[PDB]
Specification:
DNA-binding, alpha+beta, DNA polymerase, domain 1, 16 helices, two-stranded antiparallel sheet, cytoplasm, binds ligand 0KX, binds sodium ion, five-stranded mixed β-sheet, DNA damage, binds manganese (II) ion, DNA-(apurinic or apyrimidinic site) endonuclease activity
DNA sequence: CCGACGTCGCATCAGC
DNA sequence: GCTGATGCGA
DNA sequence: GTCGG
């Protein structure tokens, strides 16, 4: 419908982030691309698009050029640019951001092939990102996500039956596919007022049954790694997937569950309705805003519905949280 | 005009 | 060796 | 790049 415009803006967004290192221009282009993608008409002019929140003068100008020529001169130019295109591409490797990609291209390292010839110049994360470059860019069918959930909940309960684990993200919202697996973990012995090994014992077990295959980062509260479903007999093996496991205190668990379930826009909207009701919501707590704007102590939470009631909101199932 | 634009855990770097 | 900054992907 | 105080 407006795919040409949105693809154009998305591509401009990446070059800003990865090449120009302008994170705010990156978000600006993506916000404009998002608001246009939801627009239910084929855009006839830049002036028409400028009415949308996130589309200003510059983008309205760029849209006019695209509509009249079928392309953007600047975008066509940076596409052909060997240095810029290589920098932007290298950032597709997990662990290689704008800064690392810049350094690599500066010293002649421009392709995955070049990265493969230069392992010693890559850190642990970047090696894993390189190894699973293809797998990481694939999506995960819900059926596989269900099998992944089966393993996680089973092994977690096996370590300690008092653990509470919840797979959040787009999966919990009931999406037909997901980009990764977000696991939230808590235990009755862990509160805010509070063992340093609650997360480790879970990771260890998942590694023992060969579910977790690699580790990108691991601390006392947050694990980021790689997992893979078991090979079904003599059939083709499953792609490696990204998995995060977060250990959250019991009293902050459901604010965490609410947040990490999403979606992006839903959180933004829910934070807005909360503020107009005199409440502030982060990933940890929900707090009442005093008469002068001072935030008081965090209110007790025992479920998602508690937060919904606090701001006088009708509870919405994760299924209906796309926005 | 000009500052905000989310904030943070972990790995690793820079400086001392 | 320690501390704070930076990069990175959330 | 866009918005808004
Ligand atoms: N911009 C962001 C990023 C993260 N989040 C918190 C809520 C997002 O819905 C959520 C989970 O992040 P995510 O996995 O990167 N995105 P999401 O699960 O919606 O998409 P997939 O990666 O599962 O395809 O974390 C947020 O509210 N806003
Ligand atoms: Mn996710
Ligand atoms: Mn995620
Ligand atoms: Na990257
Ligand atoms: Na990337």
């Amino acid at each position: 419908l407006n795919g040409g415009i949105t693809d154009m803006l998305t591509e401009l967004a990446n070059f800003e982030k990865n090449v120009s290192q302008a994170i705010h221009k990156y978000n600006a282009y993506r916000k404009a691309a998002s608001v246009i993608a939801k627009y239910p008409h084929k855009i006839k002019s830049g002036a028409e698009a400028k009415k949308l929140p996130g589309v200003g003068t510059k983008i309205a100008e760029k849209i006019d050029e695209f509509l009249a020529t079928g392309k953007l001169r600047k975008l066509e130019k940076i596409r052909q640019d060997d240095t810029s295109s290589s920098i932007n591409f290298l950032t597709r490797v997990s662990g290689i951001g704008p800064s690392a990609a810049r350094k690599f291209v500066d010293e002649g390292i421009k392709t995955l092939e070049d990265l493969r010839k230069n392992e010693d110049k890559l850190n642990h994360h970047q090696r894993i990102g390189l190894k699973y470059f293809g797998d990481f860019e694939k999506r995960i069918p819900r059926e596989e996500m269900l099998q992944m959930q089966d393993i996680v909940l089973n092994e977690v309960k096996k370590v300690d039956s008092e653990y509470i684990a919840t797979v959040c993200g787009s999966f919990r919202r009931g999406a037909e596919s997901s980009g990764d697996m977000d696991v939230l973990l808590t235990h009755p012995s862990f509160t805010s007022e509070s063992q340093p090994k609650l997360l480790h014992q879970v990771v260890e077990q998942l590694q023992k049954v060969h579910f977790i295959t690699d580790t990108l980062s691991k601390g006392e509260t947050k694990f980021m790694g790689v997992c893979q479903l078991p090979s079904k007999n003599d059939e083709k093996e499953y792609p490696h997937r990204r998995i995060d496991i977060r250990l959250i205190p019991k009293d902050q668990y459901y604010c965490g569950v609410l947040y990490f379930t999403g979606s992006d826009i839903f959180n933004k909207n829910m934070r807005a309705h909360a503020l107009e009701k005199g409440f502030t919501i982060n990933e940890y707590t929900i707090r009442p805003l005093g008469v002068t704007g001072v935030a008081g102590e965090p209110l007790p939470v025992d479920s998602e519905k508690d937060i919904f009631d606090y701001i006088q909101w009708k509870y919405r199932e994760p299924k209906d949280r796309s926005e």
